[PDB]
Amino acid sequence: NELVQKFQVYYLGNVPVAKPVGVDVINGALESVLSSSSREQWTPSHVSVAPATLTILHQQTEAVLGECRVRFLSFLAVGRDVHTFAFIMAAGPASFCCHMFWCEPNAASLSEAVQAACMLRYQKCLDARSQ
């Protein structure tokens, strides 16, 4: 199944965004969601990074909060505040959705794991299509 062990983070939720890429887009989404929530409202959760999908699950009860195919993840970033992580999905052909997280001590290891999954997936796809 997974590539690494799940990440214990807070799921801040998801919001629609106008564009598939940009740190300005993800930081606008982060500011909006942080302004309309408090730390107690935050959903403790973990992110499972598998080869083809990212799955977000409720803290240790492990219900499914979201699932995302790497091929439809258009962009990811760490926010200006180093605890925040976001990725943008193409929910459909012209429809974008931004998923956001609070990470302790920071978002370094989640973002690395997600970036690595993207880079690995791209090579596996190029290689599949060249055979």
Binding site: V23, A90, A108
Partner: peptide, 27 residues
Amino acid sequence: VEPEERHLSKMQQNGYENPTYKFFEQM
């Protein structure tokens, strides 16, 4: 400056555009 630290600043200033997305996008 550390490896985690340098990759973080890059993650913050530029983020990362998934090439897997663009691969299937240009098809």
